[PDB]
Structure 1
Amino acid sequence: AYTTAQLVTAYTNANLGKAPDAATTLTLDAYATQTQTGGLSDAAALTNTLKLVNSTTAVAIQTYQFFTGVAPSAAGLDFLVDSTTNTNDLNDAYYSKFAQENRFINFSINLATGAGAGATAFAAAYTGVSYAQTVATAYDKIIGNAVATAAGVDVAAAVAFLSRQANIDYLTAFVRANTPFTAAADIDLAVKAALIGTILNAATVSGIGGYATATAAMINDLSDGALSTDNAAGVNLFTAYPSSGVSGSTLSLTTGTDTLTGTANNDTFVAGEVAGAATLTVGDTLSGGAGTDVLNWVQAAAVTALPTGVTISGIETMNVTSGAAITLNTSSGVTGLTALNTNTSGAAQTVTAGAGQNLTATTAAQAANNVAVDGGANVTVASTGVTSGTTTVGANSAASGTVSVSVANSSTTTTGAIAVTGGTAVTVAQTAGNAVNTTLTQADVTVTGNSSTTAVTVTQTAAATAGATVAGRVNGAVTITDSAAASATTAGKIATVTLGSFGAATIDSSALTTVNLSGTGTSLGIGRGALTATPTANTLTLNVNGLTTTGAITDSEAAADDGFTTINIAGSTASSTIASLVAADATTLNISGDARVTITSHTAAALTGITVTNSVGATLGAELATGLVFTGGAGADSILLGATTKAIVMGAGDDTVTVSSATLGAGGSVNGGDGTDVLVANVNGSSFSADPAFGGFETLRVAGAAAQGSHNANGFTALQLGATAGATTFTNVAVNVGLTVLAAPTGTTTVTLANATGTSDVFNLTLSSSAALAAGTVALAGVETVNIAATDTNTTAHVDTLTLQATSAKSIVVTGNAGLNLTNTGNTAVTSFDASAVTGTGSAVTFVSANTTVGEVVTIRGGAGADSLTGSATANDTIIGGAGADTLVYTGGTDTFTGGTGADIFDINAIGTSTAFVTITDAAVGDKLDLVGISTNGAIADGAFGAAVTLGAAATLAQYLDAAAAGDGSGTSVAKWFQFGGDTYVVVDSSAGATFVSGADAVIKLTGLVTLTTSAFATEVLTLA
């Protein structure tokens, strides 16, 4: 049932956006309602709608294909049928008086004989052939000759009609009048164009013929809005929309003896069950003919063997499916067989194919069942739900072509062996799909090549540690062996090996040149064949990509035999890390490519050079030999040097050399090259500026297990600090040079500037870590403004710690996105602490002023964090928290508190006077007033204590105080409150008489009228309600 509003959309898209005339809307509506009532099926109604678009559209698809060899693309069609840009187009003004027929004729003549796209080709193809032949051959290509006769239209009566003399005379006159042709050749040529226009019309109106059937399917595809093929430079109808009406004949086996013979065509043979009794049975003989022949053998019972007297012949594909095990051998009885496919679900397989036959053994829910296959041309094993089951290929007979195993396991019980022997190329692809809190350990793989085996690939799922939401995987050992691995003379064929994760892996091949690594590895041991001949080509290419290793890549051959002299490592698309590289015969080492290669530790004593050419860079964690030359490229290369004897160059990009000894040797130099390069001093003191042996460095970092003592900063533009052996000092530090601390050092870090003597000295300290960093003590004698950045490198919040010793700093400014608890002891010149710019949920800043200048103005600013800001008893502190749960502490003097947004706590730890007291500017609902530290005698109220003290129209502040303290606070301190002159006050009475005594009784001012009626005392803690 189509609604009439669906048929109009189907017509619109067929007409490429032209909406139907009023008349036709009525026609479609009829087709809709005839489907609501079941007087017409669905597909019937939609066909008729698309038949209405014949003249507009079908005229452009069919003619373009016949003349230019391809149907116009959808974008193209838009232009010919319905467009803004072509003023005159098929469904527009110019053509509105041309019938269906004369539309096809028009298009034909345009594309064929003019400057049209087909002129040159059609002119050469149909020159010097007669009218009769023109028509007969064209009728064959369009309408089929066989097809037409079967459809029952008589071909000969039709072709004669089109070529009769009357007909040709009509067109001659037609073409002569209409087209601008006057030459006698061009008229003859245009007449043929008009005829094969006429034939296209006659085809598309009857629905017989190949052109009509294909074009119909393309308009149906164009119906729903989008064209599936839509190639940009045209779609060849016949390719994209296949007919293939012939499908040969379909033959059924019985529980008897069958004698079945195919059509020499696309025929298919069914060998199912009858009452649960097999239909491939004794004496059955099957015969195929031509090459589209299929036998489908399906049985509840286990396949066992071919039954007595059975002969299958001339059949190309055999499909065997069993409810139980399969055991068959097809090296005889079956002849002509190109493809064998065997299918189990939950039982064993034991299959042997003849060479020349492509085997495919698919097994679901393999469990403890074993797959074993042999022989065949290309073999494919596809095993899922695996568990204990061995997979084993070519144990008895190798494949002619490629092996391609793949094995999936969901279990926690471990994936059972996989062994392959032989094949041109081998791939074994394991996966692990176990649950989120389990560990599956994967399958041990063995591949043993025959003398055709050029390549081997062994992929697994990446290892991981079993977590809360991390699926755990351990990797299987892999063992790859070439035929000629044990031979003294025979060549060896395995050239390339690809791994994608692995446990304890081995290769052994004298023909090996390339290893491709990937994912998570334990160890690779490379041996070459025991060839006695001294090898001449000794280049290991080692392409890495996302590789990480527990342990060692070793050249097992190098030790007692002839290893690789040159190793090339090409890092690609992802970072790689090789825990250890052991290559005892290696001479050159070239690290190349695309993404970082890190070698944590190499053992390659005979190395004469290392050469990075890689874009991102290379890092080597092992200290180079004192004799060993190193050359960097662009990108952050990074090494360790000792008392080097050679000229080390680092190339462009931001490089990093760590030195274990302060002066080099022999001679014996290291140039950082272009870019900002770090020099790391793992030593007891340095003076790199002095030594011309070092050049091109910009940053000095003191970090390492031997890093310590006095270091000449001169000539460096930045400073860094890491973990250290002991107290470290930077001397001769230029102006605008900042220190970044990257890890906890040992002992006091002293910075002494080049010239500290001025009174506007600025230093930039940075703290930069992923985790909480205990920066320790840094001393900044003679600096007036100290800027601290506390930087978190990851998304998860932390709080850094620092003792600053800056005895002439007036300003401390804190920026960043992590918290800073700052020890401030003895920093007494500080009058401005500004942590206001700081940023996280909890980048918590702690500060306590060490200022003792009587009557000072000190300004303390918090950040977004839950900050803890304490003033000085000496000082008139202005304290301001930012966002978040700030604690502001009162110590003495005239203080001004502003906890911004959030549940702030105003912690009152001093009594004050009657003049020097704390004013809280913005006390609001949620803020607390901690009076624990003024409970001189006992501990406050504890109730909700909340009726304001009220006095007269002209009572003085002095009077309101005295009134509030009237009671006896000698044994037990009491809270009261009042509102005077537009501000709110709180009192603690700790005294006898009705005098508020300045000394021991306490007042706290709160800007504005804030009603504490309903607000309650926690312990001694008043929460504003």
Structure 2
Amino acid sequence: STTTTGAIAVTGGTAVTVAQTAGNAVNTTLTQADVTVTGNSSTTAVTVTQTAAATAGATVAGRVNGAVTITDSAAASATTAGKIATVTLGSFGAATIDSSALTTVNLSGTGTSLGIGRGALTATPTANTLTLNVNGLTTTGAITDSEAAADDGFTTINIAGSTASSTIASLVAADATTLNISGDARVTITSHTAAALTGITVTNSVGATLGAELATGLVFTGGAGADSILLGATTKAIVMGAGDDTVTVSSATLGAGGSVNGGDGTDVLVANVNGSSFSADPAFGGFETLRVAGAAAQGSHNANGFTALQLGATAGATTFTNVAVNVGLTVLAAPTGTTTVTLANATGTSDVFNLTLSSSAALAAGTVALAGVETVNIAATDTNTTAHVDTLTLQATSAKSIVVTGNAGLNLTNTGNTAVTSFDASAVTGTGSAVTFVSANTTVGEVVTIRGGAGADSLTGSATANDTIIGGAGADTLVYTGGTDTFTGGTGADIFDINAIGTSTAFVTITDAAVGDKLDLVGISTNGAIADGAFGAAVTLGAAATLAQYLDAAAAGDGSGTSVAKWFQFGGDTYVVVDSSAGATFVSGADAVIKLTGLVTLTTSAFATEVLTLA
């Protein structure tokens, strides 16, 4: 049903299990049953399972969870023992337990809040260890020790994560002293409120992450596996253990003394600060990667002695100084202001930098400046299965090569990068990992090579240059600007967008024009706008007519008021002409020729607007 599951109450028994399910339809919401268990003095264990909560979607069955209330016999007594030792939950709304004999809680699925009270026993309790086994648990809100506030709570909390990731939105334990996170799968505590904590100790294989910034007085010890914390001006010796760990610091220098060692493995140090020099400070050790990310992250950062660099969202413009050779930057989120990299030594002529862009969604990497680097390698990386296009302004005024790899698109702003003679995005991979590039090269008579990838790419050369442009798979747009250009749109419906007139010597050759490819002549319509028909009888001349003769023949008509297209086949190759002139001379200046390698018959092929589609 969509109408909600009515109460469930149990009283008494050696052990109790109430197992709800919800089987409602795919666009409805059923809210589940309120459960109450009240033990008699035989009740050692209680279990209350439900179906996991979800939001009513197009194909998602909606479920809200029922409150659960568990109460032991001796819950209100000042003296009587109490019998409920273990409680197991499998999803829940606003849950309560109240038992002075409680040691273990097993959590699972989707929760709202758990409030743990112990019996109102007046005697001061001696055993005060909450074992809290988690497995696939996610919480809207707080696990609280209700007893700790005004009475005698648990002094030591143990959390054993198991077979699946768990996330506790908030853990509130005001009498807690030790906190040990153990087991088998990640435990994440988004926010703890445990002022009296003297230590935290991860022993867990996958690791533990704590989203709340630790107390400056609070010791933390990691184990194997990716543990992950936030520190301020710490007073204590923080150890991170083995595996790939992550500490975020809110202040650049520590305090008292006041240290943090990353331990074995590749560990990230995150600088949420106005500048850093972590290599210098012996207080920090065992770190390999420096990441600049956070709401206070900004300014000048000493890269020295790190083997890798990362960047996330930032407060303002951030600069990496003293960057050693073979050290690459990975950008993980949109930063604020220009990101400058300045290397240890830029002076050589074979300088290589590895920039990486790595995100699940479209990433606006912003401006990164790489003065004195000759080869710039860009990886554009998508972390999920669904395709996107990243954006970057590169300022690399002495780069000769740009190579793009990866599996996401890159629209690259290239303004002012005038040394670039080789753009190679050929290795790029998705349906639409679309690469956009425009050469900023102005060296007269240069050889420039532009390579597209699997995406629907948009590659523009330079009027200055003899551009070789090659799209990969997909709907590529190759732009002609001037000079002796060689175009190859690979597989797919490519568009050869002709925006310049050229000469009789400096013109575009299109190597592989085939059925489906287009020839956009909008930009050479000097006088008016082209044919518009299916204009398709080849100009024919004699067995030994010259290219010069065929050109003159093709331009014989009057193009003064209205430009006209014609075409011919000379010496084994196919040519297209735009006549924009009076006399029967093809005039180099305003009349235009386009070469197409091979015999391609344009008989049946038709002019769209000023756009010729090969038939």
Per-residue deviation, 1:469: 1.0
The count of residues paired between Structure 1 and Structure 2 equals 615
Paired residue for 2:576? 986
For the residues of structure 2 that align with 1:987 and 1:999, how far apart are their CA atoms?
13
Per-residue deviation, 1:987: 0.5
Task: For residues 44-81 of structure 1, give each alpha carbon's deviation from its aligned partner in whole angstroms, at most 9, with x where no partner exists.
Answer: xxxxxxxxxxxxxxxxxxxxxxxxxxxxxxxxxxxxxx
Per-residue deviation, 1:959: 1.1
SS of 1:962's partner is helix
For the residues of structure 2 that align with 1:917 and 1:864, how far apart are their CA atoms?
27
Task: For residues 15-41 of structure 1, give each alpha carbon's deviation from its aligned partner in whole angstroms, at most 9, with x where no partner exists.
Answer: xxxxxxxxxxxxxxxxxxxxxxxxxxx
2:306 maps to 1:716: yes
Per-residue deviation, 1:936: 1.1
Per-residue deviation, 1:490: 0.9
For the residues of structure 2 that align with 1:752 and 1:471, how far apart are their CA atoms?
54
Per-residue deviation, 1:617: 0.4
For the residues of structure 2 that align with 1:821 and 1:728, how far apart are their CA atoms?
22
Alignment equivalent of 2:424, drawn from 808, 831, 834: 834
For the residues of structure 2 that align with 1:649 and 1:953, how far apart are their CA atoms?
86
For the residues of structure 1 that align with 2:325 and 2:106, how far apart are their CA atoms?
51
For the residues of structure 1 that align with 2:108 and 2:391, how far apart are their CA atoms?
40
SS of 2:478's partner is strand
For the residues of structure 2 that align with 1:526 and 1:971, how far apart are their CA atoms?
89
For the residues of structure 1 that align with 2:65 and 2:527, how far apart are their CA atoms?
71
Task: For residues 471-515 of structure 1, give each alpha carbon's deviation from its aligned partner in whole angstroms, at most 9, with x where no partner exists.
Answer: 111111111111111111111111100000001101011110000
SS of 1:492's partner is coil
SS of 1:431's partner is coil
For the residues of structure 1 that align with 2:4 and 2:458, how far apart are their CA atoms?
55
Per-residue deviation, 1:888: 0.3
Paired residue for 2:603? 1013
Per-residue deviation, 1:466: 1.0
Per-residue deviation, 1:772: 0.7
Per-residue deviation, 1:413: 0.9
Pick the structure with more strand per residue: 2
Task: For residues 115-173 of structure 1, give each alpha carbon's deviation from its aligned partner in whole angstroms, at most 9, with x where no partner exists.
Answer: xxxxxxxxxxxxxxxxxxxxxxxxxxxxxxxxxxxxxxxxxxxxxxxxxxxxxxxxxxx
Alignment equivalent of 1:767, drawn from 340, 349, 357: 357
SS of 1:860's partner is strand
Paired residue for 1:433? 23
Per-residue deviation, 1:968: 1.2
Per-residue deviation, 1:908: 0.4
Per-residue deviation, 1:744: 0.5
For the residues of structure 1 that align with 2:102 and 2:269, how far apart are their CA atoms?
40
Paired residue for 1:464? 54
For the residues of structure 1 that align with 2:511 and 2:343, how far apart are their CA atoms?
42
Task: For residues 607-639 of structure 1, give each alpha carbon's deviation from its aligned partner in whole angstroms, at most 9, with x where no partner exists.
Answer: 000000000100000000000000000110000
Per-residue deviation, 1:571: 0.3
For the residues of structure 1 that align with 2:259 and 2:198, how far apart are their CA atoms?
17
SS of 1:910's partner is coil
For the residues of structure 2 that align with 1:990 and 1:578, how far apart are their CA atoms?
73
SS of 1:484's partner is helix
Paired residue for 2:555? 965
Pick the structure with more helix per residue: 1
Task: For residues 83-141 of structure 1, give each alpha carbon's deviation from its aligned partner in whole angstroms, at most 9, with x where no partner exists.
Answer: xxxxxxxxxxxxxxxxxxxxxxxxxxxxxxxxxxxxxxxxxxxxxxxxxxxxxxxxxxx
Which range is displaced more, 566-575 or 994-1003? 994-1003
SS of 2:549's partner is helix
SS of 2:552's partner is helix
Per-residue deviation, 1:989: 0.9
Per-residue deviation, 1:527: 0.6
Task: For residues 627-684 of structure 1, give each alpha carbon's deviation from its aligned partner in whole angstroms, at most 9, with x where no partner exists.
Answer: 0000000110000000000000000110000000000000000000001000000000
SS of 2:550's partner is helix
For the residues of structure 2 that align with 1:962 and 1:464, how far apart are their CA atoms?
74
Which range is displaced more, 955-964 or 869-878? 955-964
Task: For residues 588-617 of structure 1, give each alpha carbon's deviation from its aligned partner in whole angstroms, at most 9, with x where no partner exists.
Answer: 000000000000000000000000000010
For the residues of structure 1 that align with 2:238 and 2:193, how far apart are their CA atoms?
20
Paired residue for 2:228? 638
Per-residue deviation, 1:709: 0.3
Paired residue for 1:290? none
Per-residue deviation, 1:962: 1.1
Mapping 1:570-649, distance limit 5 Å: 570-649=160-239
Task: For residues 495-547 of structure 1, give each alpha carbon's deviation from its aligned partner in whole angstroms, at most 9, with x where no partner exists.
Answer: 10000000110101111000000000010000111111111110000000000
Task: For residues 287-306 of structure 1, give each alpha carbon's deviation from its aligned partner in whole angstroms, at most 9, with x where no partner exists.
Answer: xxxxxxxxxxxxxxxxxxxx
Per-residue deviation, 1:966: 1.1
For the residues of structure 2 that align with 1:569 and 1:878, how far apart are their CA atoms?
62
For the residues of structure 1 that align with 2:37 and 2:359, how far apart are their CA atoms?
47
Of all paired residues, the percent bearing the same amino acid is 100
Task: For residues 742-773 of structure 1, give each alpha carbon's deviation from its aligned partner in whole angstroms, at most 9, with x where no partner exists.
Answer: 01100000000000000000000000111111
Which range is displaced more, 545-554 or 949-958? 949-958
Structure 2 length-normalised TM: 1.00
Per-residue deviation, 1:724: 0.4
For the residues of structure 2 that align with 1:414 and 1:931, how far apart are their CA atoms?
67
SS of 1:847's partner is strand
For the residues of structure 1 that align with 2:103 and 2:283, how far apart are their CA atoms?
40
Paired residue for 1:922? 512
Higher relative contact order (CA 8 A, sep 6+): 2
SS of 1:961's partner is helix
For the residues of structure 1 that align with 2:502 and 2:63, how far apart are their CA atoms?
66
SS of 2:21's partner is strand
For the residues of structure 2 that align with 1:874 and 1:477, how far apart are their CA atoms?
73
Per-residue deviation, 1:820: 0.5
2:594 maps to 1:1004: yes
For the residues of structure 1 that align with 2:223 and 2:336, how far apart are their CA atoms?
35
Moved over 2 A (4+): none
For the residues of structure 2 that align with 1:730 and 1:451, how far apart are their CA atoms?
67
Q: Which runs of 5+ in 1 are unaligned?
A: 1-410
Task: For residues 906-928 of structure 1, give each alpha carbon's deviation from its aligned partner in whole angstroms, at most 9, with x where no partner exists.
Answer: 00011111111000000001100
For the residues of structure 1 that align with 2:529 and 2:114, how far apart are their CA atoms?
73
Per-residue deviation, 1:804: 0.3
SS of 1:697's partner is coil
Task: For residues 691-735 of structure 1, give each alpha carbon's deviation from its aligned partner in whole angstroms, at most 9, with x where no partner exists.
Answer: 000000000000000000000000000000000000000000000
Per-residue deviation, 1:953: 1.6
Per-residue deviation, 1:579: 0.4
For the residues of structure 1 that align with 2:56 and 2:580, how far apart are their CA atoms?
63
Per-residue deviation, 1:958: 1.1
Per-residue deviation, 1:575: 0.4
RMSD across aligned C-alpha pairs, in angstroms?
0.6
For the residues of structure 2 that align with 1:929 and 1:501, how far apart are their CA atoms?
62
Per-residue deviation, 1:981: 0.9
Task: For residues 766-811 of structure 1, give each alpha carbon's deviation from its aligned partner in whole angstroms, at most 9, with x where no partner exists.
Answer: 0011111110000000000000000111111111110000000000
Task: For residues 244-266 of structure 1, give each alpha carbon's deviation from its aligned partner in whole angstroms, at most 9, with x where no partner exists.
Answer: xxxxxxxxxxxxxxxxxxxxxxx
SS of 2:426's partner is coil
SS of 2:565's partner is strand
For the residues of structure 2 that align with 1:892 and 1:467, how far apart are their CA atoms?
55
Per-residue deviation, 1:458: 0.2
Per-residue deviation, 1:436: 0.9
For the residues of structure 2 that align with 1:769 and 1:529, how far apart are their CA atoms?
50
Task: For residues 178-205 of structure 1, give each alpha carbon's deviation from its aligned partner in whole angstroms, at most 9, with x where no partner exists.
Answer: xxxxxxxxxxxxxxxxxxxxxxxxxxxx
- Whose Rg is larger? 1
For the residues of structure 2 that align with 1:425 and 1:738, how far apart are their CA atoms?
59
Alignment equivalent of 1:523, drawn from 101, 105, 113: 113
For the residues of structure 2 that align with 1:962 and 1:438, how far apart are their CA atoms?
75
Which range is displaced more, 777-786 or 414-423? 414-423
Per-residue deviation, 1:955: 1.3
2:531 maps to 1:941: yes
SS of 1:558's partner is helix
Per-residue deviation, 1:971: 1.3
